[PDB]
Symmetry: D2
Subunit: 508 residues, 4 copies
């Protein structure tokens, strides 16, 4: 069984990985990793928001099945994740960094978690479909990220990611000490960074890399509120866009700091791979690179995620290591496919994972078997007033919301999604394609039931959360375990025996 290193980042627009990292990015370590990787060019999040995407990523199940509809929805402990599947199959599993799990279980199958979460574990960020049009200023996104972009040497997120990286490398060194033990468990380490999620604020060393950057304005500029589709209008209102004057210079500084933060992350990828190389674990390790959702980065005038346009819904996905053919894949894939792919790579049978996953293993794709299943997406959090669903199949993207006109995009002819073919069909094939996706949408979702489930989940939480914020608060944040009395040299040990056990490689 190979080891598995999952490197996850937050809010990375997948269009920036057209074949590994785009040429204009300063990302030597991810570009070298890409050359060894199977690269999934048209890979999609299952839900364009952090906690829904991550609960879905961990379980290989859509939000409608995990019930994690938004950033404050409880993730049940009894739902199997890839950590459970691998752990059941004999793996040591650990997590360093972010997973935005909501509720008192902060492990969800991981055997060890090295850091707390950057974001809350409670029900505070619960949307309310009963009050459509409201926004909550103390936690909603707003365009102050765009007007406040710039340069700093420490931020909340850089403190977080510096520690995620350090503790992940330390864990790799600790794991190497078992390398000569025949009975060692294989390990699976998830390293989950919060960058390049906003605030768009970068260390000067990486900001300086992009002085001459030619990609600091999006190709598709800002669409006026009156000319926007209804969901994009709800997003603009939820970002408080009327109270911010976003200048061309703000757009450029935001994109520049965001690319700088990709370079910041690239340096950390290089450290992890260096640790794997020096500890002699690299040849036996699969490395997966992934992200939870994208960032519109100013395209169409939109920032952040919460929608199904390419910039928000596309995320990179790369896999390298023993048995993976390097190459670029164009067939659309999904984050839903990661858990069954990890299971397959770990030698777990198809039947063991079948009842628990909605995705498919990508290993047959890597080995030249055509993948035909569509890619599905869902959204049911802030800036929605009712659930949205999307189907990505072939060259098409279809988006449905009971409250909105449908959207249909031909991404081969119209990759910037500038022409809505459900509104303006080019001909008879477009009308037939629309009818096919409507039948497909009825085959996969009951949208009235979906809306009812989301409403009940929100209503429960608002009752419970109001109570939990009265009186003494009981926090659910993960606290990494304390072990000082068993670490380093203690006087129930023999010093020479301890030193030999902690040294690796030995006798060289």
């Amino acid at each position: 069984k190979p080891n598995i290193l999952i490197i996850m980042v937050d809010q990375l627009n997948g269009k920036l990985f057209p074949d590994g990292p785009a040429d204009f990015l300063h990302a030597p370590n991810l570009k070298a990793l890409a050359k060894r990787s199977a690269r999934f060019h048209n890979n999609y999040t299952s839900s364009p928001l952090a906690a829904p995407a991550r609960a879905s990523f961990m379980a290989g199940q859509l939000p409608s099945r995990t019930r994690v509809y938004d950033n404050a929805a409880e993730y049940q402990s009894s739902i199997p994740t890839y950590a459970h599947h691998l752990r059941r199959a004999g793996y040591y599993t650990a997590l360093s960094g972010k997973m935005h799990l909501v509720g008192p279980d902060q492990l969800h199958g991981f055997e060890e978690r090295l850091t707390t979460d950057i974001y809350p574990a409670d029900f505070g960020w619960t949307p309310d479909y009963r009050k459509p049009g409201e926004r909550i200023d103390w936690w909603y996104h707003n365009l102050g990220s765009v007007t406040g972009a710039g340069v700093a040497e420490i931020t909340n997120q850089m403190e977080y990611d510096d520690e995620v990286a350090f503790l992940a490398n330390q864990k790799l060194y600790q794991l190497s000490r078992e390398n000569d033990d025949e009975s060692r468990r294989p390990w699976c380490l998830t390293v989950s960074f919060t960058h390049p999620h906003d605030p768009y604020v970068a260390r000067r060393k990486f900001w300086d890399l992009y002085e001459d950057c030619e990609h600091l304005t999006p190709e598709v500029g800002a669409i006026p509120l009156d000319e926007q589709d209804p969901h994009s209008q709800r997003i603009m209102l939820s970002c408080d866009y009327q109270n911010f004057d976003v200048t061309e210079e703000n757009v450029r500084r935001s994109r520049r700091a965001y690319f700088a933060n990709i370079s910041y992350l690239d340096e950390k990828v290089g450290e992890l791979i260096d640790t794997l190389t020096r500890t002699r674990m690299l040849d036996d390790t699969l490395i997966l690179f992934c992200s939870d959702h994208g960032d519109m980065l100013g395209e169409r005038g939109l920032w952040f995620k919460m929608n199904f346009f390419e910039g928000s819904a596309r995320v990179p996905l790369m896999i390298a290591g023993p048995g993976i053919a390097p190459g670029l894949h164009l067939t659309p894939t999904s984050n839903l496919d990661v858990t069954p792919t990890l299971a397959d790579l770990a030698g777990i049978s198809l039947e063991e994972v079948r009842p628990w996953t909605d995705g498919v293993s990508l290993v047959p794709m890597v080995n030249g078997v055509e993948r035909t299943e569509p890619v599905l997406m869902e959204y049911a959090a802030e800036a929605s007033y009712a659930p949205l669903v999307a189907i990505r199949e072939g060259k098409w993207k279809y988006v449905y919301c009971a409250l909105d006109p449908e959207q249909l995009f031909d991404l081969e002819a119209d990759p910037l999604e500038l022409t809505n073919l459900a509104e303006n069909p080019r001909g008879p094939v477009d009308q037939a394609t629309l009818t096919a996706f409507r039948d497909m949408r009825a085959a996969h979702w009951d949208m009235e039931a979906f809306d009812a489930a989301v409403r009940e989940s929100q209503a429960r939480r608002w009752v419970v959360y109001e109570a939990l914020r009265n009186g003494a608060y009981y926090p659910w944040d993960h606290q990494p375990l304390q072990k000082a009395s068993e670490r380093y040299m203690r006087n129930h040990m023999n010093l020479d025996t301890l030193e030999e056990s902690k040294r690796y490689p030995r006798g060289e």
Copy 2:
């Protein structure tokens, strides 16, 4: 708003509370409490097993709605409980003792929990409908409790309940120090004991009280396996009955220690009442006495719970205090009614709890209003191979399982449930009644959907639990909060100011 003291005990057969405690029980404090209480004589659990009964009790929802089907089913943190409803209404809420919550949330709305649980918080005790007939010896009930009954001065349970009682009285004293602050929150303290749950082992002082006891033998004796109904057979097999020779003296020793442990609990009830009296909180405090399920106590040859017969499904319920007229009520009620009753007594509107509770407030009954809503029960754990449901309405009890012959009992004519009127109707009224209950059951439950939901829950947990028991174990047991650097006299305080604040009256 009144204070609320909830005294809960585990595995207390409600037939032993015919009008408060039975005369033969040595329970002077519970009898004095019962004399000033509204007493609900025909009160039922929602599910005859610890965790399902308690999750249902806390939420006022049936197991099919809470999804807590068995003793290892996760209770979701987002489900509102009476703790949430009261806390939201401005109560300080606390738990001392047992609640058998499964999963990483060990508070479920309680603001403070003073003890860990006596039982596990993880998925270990998950049944498996895919292996009907199996038993898990290391945690199933077995008849060894009956053959091992007797006397001891300490047990696992007595250690637990001694501490539960101590910390509850300590908390009451602590709360009394706020009794002169007009800004004080009203409090709701749940004190949840593990007795008289088995092992049937009692301290000598309480065992000696039942030497001449006339109730050491059940009136309905053991029914041989071949004459038992199918569910009773499944229970006997689950208890490993074939590997135990249960003598008459075994039966007598078990009941004697069980009664003795009721007397053990009665002394602790008196301690709490005493604390309320001397702190001068008694007149402003509602007191509820309740249990999660009963114990067959050898009746029909069965022990423990897991069934809908009276001894297992009946539990006492009493309410006393400000605005509570004392009296005996015979209309059937259930534990499902406690959470809406608590909300009503705390002044919460019916509309605030209507979407979250499926029982009804008993406060109208206390004030003379006739109740007509039937009582529903569910069971889907060990010794079931498919879910069972029951309906209790008027004089009738109806029990359905897709795998078993139906049962119908007329509890006025047949209080010991010796004649199954579904099999042996007395005439056309019994047949019409059976048809009426079948139609009512079909309107309330799809038993095939219920069975699918339970199997899905079991299978899910078996994947997860096998993973969680590999590698380093992460426990979910509640650990009461460590406060030593802030307790008593510390040198950021003024000693005189501290002594005055801690003195009451």
Copy 3:
């Protein structure tokens, strides 16, 4: 090896134990214990203040040797205590309650400590010989305890002692589960209550016992400030006496509540004895009753301790159990003798404890052997401006401070210490006696070296403590160990095996 139960109380005037508890005290359990005890009637503290007395008590060394001169002096972890000596000899050792250890070590050899301390563990209460005459209002004794005496159902101290008692009895029950394992360690449990230390506030049930009490007034009344000896004057000033109008009824209420809190403690003594009896450990258990210092209780107009007069310096001491002949002993003894007495009773050789203890075993006295070693006492805390030492030998008490007139009392002729024979000798024998005590004092103490050592200790702590109270505070208070994932039933265990191991007998 016998078990050892040490019952310690705080601030108990030893004159109230003339032969066990005084007849007028309602203390049936302590009187029954005293009837089977060796009782040491003329027993003295080593230092009339909490932390110095207790550090001296634990080590069997005087404050000049432990360096614990006052209530804020660090007790070094390397100093052997009776806990170390017994633990080294194979005992499990535990503490429930108070010991007023100062510094980051809150165990000092105890293997387990069941409660935090009621008092601070840091250097806050450090006196300063550089500012003679100052008082620190936020922690000094003051006469407000006398004017504030009365009745309450909870206090800071009653919360503390209720918990001390509960956890001690719980621990005894836990220890009984090992009583049938031949490989068991013998145990030594120290149960250390804060009562009858002030505030003089009692529960109504115990206060009502002293309604017709004839001992509510001390026989020796208040001595006016100008007629007081210099040290007594320093105590009255330290207590802020000028700002309190202490009436006769104040005096009576304080003594009444103090006696009532002795009765409060007596009920807890009976609880412990009951636990030992029902667990069948009583016959194999030594029981020691002791106190750290006394309380003047208004005698001479003084309250509390900090002096060498009988009411402040006398503390009871009793020993009962296997191999202990009951009887009354009048030869002076001291708390310094407890640690070598415990070691001797546990079978530890005299040579193993000789280098670490400066008292003597009382076991020879119990067996009829005359004791001749004198009793020494020291004091160097608040209301002293330089150290004081005392010698107690035969009928005599001698008290020296470089700043004050000497005191010499003949306690046979003058048990209330009303005639200072150093100032008013009766004849040449008194003068020769004074000279003999002066020579003995000079051989035992260099008072100038003692004073330099105390000032150095105070000054050191004042530099350190001012730093430690800047920025984030790091508390040294003991936090009892969190064990919830290993207590009661957990799913790495077999339930039947667990129930059997936790049941005893």
Copy 4:
């Protein structure tokens, strides 16, 4: 008040810093630091063993005064340290890394401690003068460090120091967030590394730096046991030297890994200085570089410390920052002088520190005032059977032990200490110098009282420690504080307010 960064390392032979780091060392960051520093060439430990040196360093008091005679002697909480003095004067004080404090107080005035200790906090390593000639194999030094030298990518010590460095830099970044607050406290951060203490085992990257090294054998080779002075013989026996065949190749590999570990440390010095530079704190920060004791590194056949020869007793000392003239100082100085120097640099009056320190401030030396006080040293731990004391004054070193012949060395004429002038006086001046040091030794120490105090301390601890190791053990190791429920974003906070507070510099 300037900030103060104290960089401490363990077991660094001071002869390797002849004027900053020796030319042959690969240490660019320490060499650049040295060019800005006042450098104390003839600086001495106060006691050649870890815990005695460190308790003495913290208090500015000799072991005879601190009572910390050996590696298991309790350090009383009531003894003032430089952390107390600075904290009382308004400083935030923190420690990352090792201080080998014995006893339940693991802070000794530090307001925060970021790591546990690498070594035990209990009484286990207590020598026993009642059994002269015994050794305790499970914790005594032995020459297996020399025969086991080599190359590894992780060791006990590298795991420790990697975390010391990471958490120290993180603390600097956190402290920078207060930089614009007028009411900020100044900070004093001690960063205390365990390298280059043995095992002599280094990462390959740094080992490779010394392939051509010309210093891999000591100038003074191994002295046979019969030809050794009595204390050196006791050290050889305590190291179990008879059971090890130390080859020339072992000597070279040990020295090579030790120099590699200096280079490992030099990289961490560079990171700390980079953090100070980017956070804009460097110009207001004093940087002190120091060590607890040396390492003989094979010289005379000896390894490790425990003696007063130059290699064991000399340690580097450098100070750089506002108001310090750079330059090299030859007058002998002591680690005892650090606490009163820090006090002086922080503006604390001489009188405030006078009753609590045995050393003198070095600031007047830096400013051209001649220092005349001698340097004193003491040793009373393993391989001593009675206390040893030493005086270093002018060109002389004098060593006294009641059980041994005296030693007298003229370090100007005889810098390798090859001629004992107390045994072979060159003339009448040598005999007069010996008599002067004897009178000086009687003026500073009562050696019989010293021996009695050490004996009583050992005897107490053996009683107590035997008891503490019966039954359940209560550990004293420092456990760094848990704060997950107050870290990063929690839902009692406003997200925008949090991000602004955690970003620094702001608005750039």
